[PDB]
């Protein structure tokens, strides 16, 4: 199965009759590069306009397409490909940075207080275990995120894609940062199964060790947001583990095996990851915005005391790549796996409206 970010935009009842005009989105890059024609091709192909794309460098990183599929280029054209695709209207801001702790922190200090572009989303599909970074790196990217909440931008971060470990052979779970930042909306992802606009079935995105997994859990940096307290977030599963933010706080379809038709240096293909999920909600968002006339920014707090109809539970599967205990599974509401499920968007913007 494979479907077009139409497609899956469809199932999740995105608002139509919205493109995100006057919206600009910033995408987060650390490598790679993108080809603005290439991306011409692939919009002209589903139908929807090339949206306005611009680069901007940083710590003198730029756009520099590597000419890998399997590379950076990846990340890049999937990131503008999905969100592009979704809101068409929308202006496009690719800040490229070294894929470091220092440029990535450059790069999103860069897109927030952009007095140029000024977007009111920051789409971001890079990051690594929360005890990997920087503790100036750490405080320095929750500086910014406070940045961004304090001028109406939503910031968006893809969970991860190596399951409750996150990548770490230490034999630990482990969350990715920045999705623990709980200033950040930290994005899940699941299998979808849909047909004629409805879910027909929807769980974890578990492919194992070899087909990658939803990131998730529970951060021992930071601590259970008070809006995250009636969610039964649980200890982390290390042994000790205290109270700490969980992960995911949102999920959509993630799963390479149900993946996304997009087109990577020039290379028709079906792509994954949870790196495909914040790019789809940050177009969600663009609309949203439009709708409502003004940027909704930092919703953290407002999800987690939204009606739950807001959103389509997942309650089926495990994001554990690392062994058979399961850990995290999913389940009724707020889950380590999938947050608070797939959003609906009518309702989502709905529930927003004034
Ligand atoms: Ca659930």
């Known amino acids: 199965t494979a479907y077009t970010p139409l497609d899956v935009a469809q199932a999740y009842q995105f608002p139509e009759g919205?493109?995100?005009?006057?919206?600009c989105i910033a995408i987060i890059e650390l490598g790679g590069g993108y080809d603005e024609a290439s991306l011409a091709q692939y919009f002209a192909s589903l139908g929807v306009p090339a949206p306005q794309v611009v680069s901007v460098s940083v710590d003198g990183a730029?756009?520099?397409?590597?000419?890998?599929?399997?590379?950076?280029?990846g990340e890049?054209?999937?990131?503008?490909?999905?969100?592009?695709?979704?809101?068409?209207?929308?202006?496009?801001?690719?800040?490229?940075?070294?894929?470091?702790?220092?440029?990535?922190?450059?790069?999103?200090?860069?897109?927030?207080?952009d007095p140029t572009l000024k977007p009111?989303?920051?789409?971001?599909?890079?990051?690594?275990?929360?005890?990997?970074?920087?503790?100036?790196?750490?405080?320095?990217?929750?500086?910014?995120?406070?940045?961004?909440?304090?001028?109406?931008?939503?910031?968006?971060?893809?969970?991860?894609?190596?399951?409750?470990?996150?990548?770490?052979?230490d034999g630990l779970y482990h969350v990715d940062f920045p999705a623990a930042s709980p200033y950040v909306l930290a994005c899940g992802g699941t299998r979808l199964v849909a047909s004629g606009g409805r879910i027909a079935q929807e769980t974890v995105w578990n492919d194992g060790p070899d087909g990658g997994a939803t990131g998730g859990g529970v951060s021992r940096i930071f601590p259970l947001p008070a809006w995250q307290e009636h969610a039964n977030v649980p200890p982390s599963a290390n042994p000790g583990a205290s109270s700490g933010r969980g992960v995911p706080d949102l999920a959509g379809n993630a799963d390479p095996a149900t993946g996304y038709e997009v087109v990577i240096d020039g290379e028709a293909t079906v792509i994954g990851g949870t790196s495909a999920v914040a790019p789809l909600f940050a177009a969600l968002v663009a609309r949203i915005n439009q709708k409502l006339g003004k940027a909704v920014g930092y919703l953290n707090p407002t999800?987690?005391?939204?009606?739950?109809?807001?959103?389509?539970?997942?309650?089926?599967?495990?994001?554990?790549?690392?062994?058979?205990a399961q850990i995290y599974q999913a389940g009724p509401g707020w889950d380590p796996c999938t947050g608070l499920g797939s959003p609906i968007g009518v309702r989502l913007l709905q529930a927003l409206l004034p």
């Not at 919205?18 to 919206?23: A, I, N, V």
């Not at 990131?79 to 790069?107: H, M, Q, R, S």
């Not at 500086?143 to 996150?166: E, K």
């Open 62 to 73: 730029s756009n520099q397409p590597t000419g890998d599929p399997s590379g950076p280029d």
């Open 303 to 324: 999800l987690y005391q939204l009606p739950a109809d807001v959103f389509h539970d997942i309650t089926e599967g495990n994001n554990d790549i690392a062994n058979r």
């Open 18 to 23: 919205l493109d995100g005009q006057g919206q």
């Open 120 to 169: 009111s989303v920051v789409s971001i599909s890079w990051g690594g275990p929360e005890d990997s970074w920087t503790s100036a790196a750490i405080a320095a990217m929750n500086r910014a995120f406070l940045d961004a909440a304090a001028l109406g931008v939503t910031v968006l971060a893809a969970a991860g894609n190596s399951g409750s470990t996150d990548g770490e052979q």
């Open 76 to 113: 890049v054209e999937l990131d503008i490909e999905v969100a592009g695709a979704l809101a068409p209207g929308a202006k496009f801001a690719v800040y490229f940075a070294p894929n470091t702790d220092a440029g990535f922190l450059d790069a999103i200090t860069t897109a927030i207080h």
